[PDB]
Ligand binder design. Structure first.
Ligand code: FAD
Ligand code: NAP
Ligand code: 6NA
Length: 529
């Protein structure tokens, strides 16, 4: 008989909600282990300047509690890291969840014990305990990726990853270097350029970026949104990307050149990178002329905004508009600042980090006090592979994932009885809170069913999982997304497999898949009594 009914790993959006359901709704004995010193997951760790979410604030939140929806106010269109952290803290208080969240506790081992049919979980702290159900809410974008750049550890000043931003660090008036220009890099750069004495950008691959449209909320708009929240959430849940806008059904090449320009301009003026990729035309990410047209539209704005022709050239990507789409408050305009310098690593690669800065292949030592790694994450599977996580057959999860990470439905794993993942591999690529709520609710129901019916294990079959791999691959091969090199398909860490790691059918379709599996009696699962 186990120490706990369930153990949940992680105290981000995922685990907070998981806990709430397993404890407050099902009345189970549950504990959460979180390695951080406080709850919030992403929004605990990512304390860097400019950290914020690109999901517009009205839908970057839970939806399951209608009271909370209507009581909580947000004051700017998009939510800053501190505003989201404060929200997740308020949820934690609201639901009396802190008492079952054990902070500072890294789970190092999770071992299915076939004798007892229980999960045995070990912490860095040398606690081992048993639970019937394990839920892993480890975060898709949680495990910092810090490349082994030569000389990195010789750097004399403050060297930090964005995902480890120390609360004491004030970059005001300092000479700041940043490596990486994805969504983290670029929003850091915008905010950091207002603070630092000099900001040096080390850019390996330029990205496309559109305006965010960020700005203050009017209390009447907040009221309007809240009046209509039921409707708003219905739209979200039947949408593709769940960002609170209706995706376009217009093929981009089916209108005039003037119409393409106007639709793009209109989306540019309103802002949001997901709006620009999906609310403009329906085939930006499937049709290559449609994509090329979106991309050229962005290039023309770079060339207009950026006054130095050389900087504009270095900023202008030539590859597909098919990475996670960015937005920012005046990203390209930042490079007209006099305290910002752009180094292209295609032309002048980093040779060595040295005590006083970064020496590039040109021989130039860029002298710096702070070196910021916005070099992203061992995404999706990183925290799973770094855990001593072993299933029924005693094999480490790495031995099940030799071609890429796998699951059934993004939330279960063949060979891993009674384990459920929140934002596991091959789940939705959407505004994440509502995908999380879908997962959590679905897991709950199943755990509750095993409970009421006296099941001992629940496990997806090997065939069900391999069917889901097929599905995810086939959906991704109908898109351009696999032709974009990023973390989304792995390989952003040399030696990491290149592989499909998301269900790209969208939230509405992903919810339907979940509800079909439930409602048909969990075909694909072995339900042992
Ligand atoms: C800068 C930034 C901006 C983003 N903007 C958006 C956005 O606009 N829209 C959007 O949908 N998503 C965005 N995301 C993704 C974001 O991660 C999700 O929105 C959401 O916060 C995920 O919550 P989660 O609980 O699944 O994972 P996380 O919030 O990543 O929480 C996972 C937790 O698990 C803990 N943990 C991991 N492994 C272990 C272990 N072995 N033992 C113990 N604890 C462990 C971690 O320390 C972490 O606290 C953004 C991410 C970042 C980093
Ligand atoms: N605004 C938001 O809502 C927001 C903010 C931050 C993060 N996020 C989410 O988090 C995801 C990850 O974002 P991210 O920007 O943190 O990571 P990222 O998209 O993985 O970008 C990593 C950056 O570091 C660079 N890089 C990696 N290895 C390097 C090396 N060895 N040398 C030099 N440069 C290197 C990459 O260049 P290459 O492209 O050449 O590899 C890229 O510019 C986003 O895509 C998004 O989903 C969202
Ligand atoms: C896995 C990430 C899904 C999209 C939310 C984001 O880009 O932050």
């Amino acid at each position: 008989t186990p120490d706990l009914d369930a153990i949940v790993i992680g105290a981000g959006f995922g685990g907070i909600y998981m806990l709430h359901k397993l404890r407050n709704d099902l009345g189970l004995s549950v504990r959460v282990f979180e390695k951080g010193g406080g709850v919030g997951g992403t929004w605990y760790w990512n304390k860097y300047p400019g950290a914020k979410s690109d999901t517009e604030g009205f839908v970057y939140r839970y939806s399951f509690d209608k009271e909370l929806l209507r009581e909580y106010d947000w004051t700017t269109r998009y939510l800053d890291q501190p505003d989201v952290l404060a929200y997740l803290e308020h949820v934690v208080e609201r639901y009396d969840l802190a008492r079952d969240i054990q902070l500072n506790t890294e789970v190092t081992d999770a071992i299915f014990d076939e004798e007892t049919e229980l999960w045995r979980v070990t912490t860095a702290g040398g606690e081992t305990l048993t639970a019937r159900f394990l839920v892993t809410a480890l975060g898709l974008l949680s495990r910092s990726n810090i490349p082994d750049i030569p000389g990195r550890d010789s750097f004399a000043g403050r060297l930090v990853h964005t995902n480890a931003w120390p609360e004491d660090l004030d970059i005001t008036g300092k000479r700041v270097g940043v490596i990486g220009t994805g969504s983290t890099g670029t929003q850091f750069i915008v905010a950091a350029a207002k603070m630092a004495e000099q900001l040096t950008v080390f850019q390996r691959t330029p990205q496309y970026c559109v305006p965010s449209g960020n700005g203050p909320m009017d209390p009447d708009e907040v009221a309007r949104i809240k009046q209509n929240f039921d409707s708003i959430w219905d739209q979200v849940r039947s949408s593709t990307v769940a960002f609170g806008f209706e995706e376009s059904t217009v093929e981009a090449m089916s209108v005039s050149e003037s119409e393409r320009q106007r639709v793009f301009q209109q989306a540019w003026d309103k802002g949001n990178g997901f709006r620009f990729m999906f609310g403009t035309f329906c085939d930006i990410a499937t049709n290559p002329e449609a994509n090329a047209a979106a991309a050229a539209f962005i290039r023309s704005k770079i060339a207009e905004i950026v006054k130095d022709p050389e900087t504009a050239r270095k900023l202008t990507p030539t590859d597909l508009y098919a990475k996670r789409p960015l937005c920012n408050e005046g990203y390209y305009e930042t490079y007209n600042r006099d305290n910002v310098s752009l180094v292209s690593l295609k032309e002048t690669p980093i040779e060595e980090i040295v005590p006083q800065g970064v020496r590039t292949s040109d021989g130039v030592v860029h002298e710096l006090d702070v070196l910021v790694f916005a070099t992203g994450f061992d995404a999706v599977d990183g925290n799973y592979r770094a855990m001593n996580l072993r299933g029924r057959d005693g094999r480490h999860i790495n031995e099940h994932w030799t071609e890429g990470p796998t699951s059934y439905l993004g939330v279960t794993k063949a060979g891993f009885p009674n384990m459920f993942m929140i934002l596991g591999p091959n789940g939705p690529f959407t505004n994440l809170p509502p995908s999380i709520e879908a997962q959590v609710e679905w897991i709950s129901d199943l755990i509750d069913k095993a409970t009421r019916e006296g099941l001992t294990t629940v496990e997806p079959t090997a065939d069900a999982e391999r069917e889901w791999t097929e599905t995810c691959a086939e959906i991704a091969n109908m898109t351009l997304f696999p032709k974009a090199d990023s973390w989304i398909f792995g390989a952003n860490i040399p030696g990491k497999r290149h592989a499909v790691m998301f269900y790209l059918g969208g939230l509405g379709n992903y919810r339907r898949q979940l509800a079909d599996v439930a409602d048909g009696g969990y075909r694909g699962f072995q339900l042992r009594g």
